[PDB]
Design a protein around this motif. Structure first.
Motif, PDB file in Angstrom:
ATOM      1  N   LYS A  78      11.021  -3.945  10.977  1.00  5.57           N
ATOM      2  CA  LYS A  78      12.403  -3.583  10.655  1.00  5.57           C
ATOM      3  C   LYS A  78      12.744  -2.213  11.198  1.00  5.57           C
ATOM      4  CE  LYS A  78      13.067  -6.381   6.512  1.00  5.57           C
ATOM      5  NZ  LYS A  78      13.310  -6.340   5.047  1.00  5.57           N
ATOM      6  N   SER A  80      -0.675  -4.060   4.045  1.00 11.12           N
ATOM      7  CA  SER A  80      -0.405  -5.425   3.592  1.00 11.12           C
ATOM      8  C   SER A  80       0.490  -6.095   4.651  1.00 11.12           C
ATOM      9  CB  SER A  80       0.366  -5.383   2.258  1.00 11.12           C
ATOM     10  OG  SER A  80       1.628  -4.776   2.468  1.00 11.12           O
ATOM     11  N   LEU A  84       6.918   3.736   4.832  1.00 10.52           N
ATOM     12  CA  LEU A  84       7.862   3.043   5.714  1.00 10.52           C
ATOM     13  C   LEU A  84       9.167   2.717   5.021  1.00 10.52           C
ATOM     14  CD1 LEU A  84       5.357   0.744   7.580  1.00 10.52           C
ATOM     15  CD2 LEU A  84       6.520   2.731   8.476  1.00 10.52           C
ATOM     16  N   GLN A  85       9.114   2.365   3.729  1.00  6.86           N
ATOM     17  CA  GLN A  85      10.344   2.090   2.970  1.00  6.86           C
ATOM     18  C   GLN A  85      11.215   3.334   2.939  1.00  6.86           C
ATOM     19  OE1 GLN A  85       8.844   0.906  -0.860  1.00  6.86           O
ATOM     20  NE2 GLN A  85       8.861  -1.283  -0.351  1.00  6.86           N
ATOM     21  N   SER A 125       0.823  -1.197   0.000  1.00  9.11           N
ATOM     22  CA  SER A 125       0.000   0.000   0.000  1.00  9.11           C
ATOM     23  C   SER A 125       0.868   1.262   0.000  1.00  9.11           C
ATOM     24  CB  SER A 125      -0.839  -0.008   1.276  1.00  9.11           C
ATOM     25  OG  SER A 125       0.030   0.158   2.388  1.00  9.11           O
ATOM     26  N   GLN A 157       1.121   3.153   2.538  1.00 10.98           N
ATOM     27  CA  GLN A 157       1.766   3.101   3.865  1.00 10.98           C
ATOM     28  C   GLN A 157       3.085   2.310   3.800  1.00 10.98           C
ATOM     29  OE1 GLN A 157      -0.479   2.204   7.538  1.00 10.98           O
ATOM     30  NE2 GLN A 157      -2.279   3.195   6.672  1.00 10.98           N
ATOM     31  N   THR A 158       3.116   1.222   2.987  1.00 11.39           N
ATOM     32  CA  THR A 158       4.345   0.438   2.834  1.00 11.39           C
ATOM     33  C   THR A 158       5.438   1.348   2.203  1.00 11.39           C
ATOM     34  OG1 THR A 158       2.896  -1.428   2.313  1.00 11.39           O
ATOM     35  CG2 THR A 158       5.248  -1.748   1.914  1.00 11.39           C
ATOM     36  N   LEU A 203       7.896  -4.151   7.406  1.00 12.41           N
ATOM     37  CA  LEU A 203       8.677  -2.910   7.426  1.00 12.41           C
ATOM     38  C   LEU A 203       8.557  -2.208   8.737  1.00 12.41           C
ATOM     39  CD1 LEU A 203       8.129  -1.512   3.903  1.00 12.41           C
ATOM     40  CD2 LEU A 203      10.087  -2.729   4.672  1.00 12.41           C
ATOM     41  N   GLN A 204       7.365  -2.242   9.373  1.00  7.34           N
ATOM     42  CA  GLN A 204       7.213  -1.624  10.702  1.00  7.34           C
ATOM     43  C   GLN A 204       8.144  -2.304  11.702  1.00  7.34           C
ATOM     44  OE1 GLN A 204       3.080  -2.313  11.571  1.00  7.34           O
ATOM     45  NE2 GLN A 204       2.425  -0.315  10.759  1.00  7.34           N
ATOM     46  N   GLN A 257       3.534  -6.789   4.019  1.00  5.30           N
ATOM     47  CA  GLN A 257       4.813  -6.088   3.917  1.00  5.30           C
ATOM     48  C   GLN A 257       4.856  -4.832   4.777  1.00  5.30           C
ATOM     49  OE1 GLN A 257       7.585  -7.179   2.718  1.00  5.30           O
ATOM     50  NE2 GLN A 257       8.874  -5.367   2.380  1.00  5.30           N
ATOM     51  N   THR A 258       3.700  -4.183   4.992  1.00  9.50           N
ATOM     52  CA  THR A 258       3.649  -3.002   5.853  1.00  9.50           C
ATOM     53  C   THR A 258       4.085  -3.451   7.264  1.00  9.50           C
ATOM     54  OG1 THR A 258       1.747  -2.216   4.560  1.00  9.50           O
ATOM     55  CG2 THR A 258       2.183  -1.070   6.676  1.00  9.50           C
ATOM     56  N   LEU A 302      12.886   3.973   6.408  1.00  5.78           N
ATOM     57  CA  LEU A 302      13.985   3.019   6.579  1.00  5.78           C
ATOM     58  C   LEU A 302      15.203   3.455   5.763  1.00  5.78           C
ATOM     59  CD1 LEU A 302      12.263  -0.470   6.593  1.00  5.78           C
ATOM     60  CD2 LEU A 302      13.816   0.457   8.321  1.00  5.78           C
TER      61      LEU A 302
END
Ligand SMILES: Cc1cc(CN(C)C(=O)NC2CC2)no1
Ligand SMILES: [Zn+2]
Ligand SMILES: [Zn+2]
Ligand SMILES: [Zn+2]
Ligand SMILES: [Zn+2]
Lengths: 71, 72
Positions: B10, B1, A7-8, A1, A3-4, B7-8, B3-4, A11
């Motif tokens: 990590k 998802s 976050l990427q 999404s 949101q992903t 990543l949270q 993957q969210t 990071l």
């Protein structure tokens, strides 16, 4: 999404902040003493006479072992 | 998802690795010299006569200014 993707980005930015400000390739692992700026890898810190952040004289370089080290 | 969530996790672990290993509350900003272990905030580092990672005597504490530092 979306949101992903956010976050990427967070990071990526945090990881980039851990890299040497001169070569941009190796992890920071050296401190200029006595000022305390910890912004270079060992190679880049080796010949600097003055700090690249504050211009203070570098009396010596202290190696630092950080829990975030992964290289 | 899913993957969210990955990543949270990590991001959380990377942020936790930048926090003091003793109090778990404040950012790491201090190096035990001469051994070089940089694992504590200033308050915990001032109270330890021996490094908590390697047990070498602490001759003095060097404050470190890191690009990753954050504040309120
Ligand atoms: C290298 C380099 C760049 C800089 C920028 N800066 C912080 C200043 O010039 N400060 C003023 C007080 C003198 N300092 O060192
Ligand atoms: Zn470098
Ligand atoms: Zn400096
Ligand atoms: Zn602490
Ligand atoms: Zn140590």
């Amino acid at each position: 999404s979306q949101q992903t993707r956010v976050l990427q980005e967070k990071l990526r930015k945090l990881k980039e902040a851990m890299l040497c400000m001169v070569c941009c390739e190796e992890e920071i692992n050296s401190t200029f003493c006595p000022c305390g700026h910890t912004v270079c890898c060992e190679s880049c810190a080796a010949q600097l006479q003055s700090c690249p952040v504050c211009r203070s004289r570098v009396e010596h370089v202290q190696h630092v072992y950080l829990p975030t080290h992964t290289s």
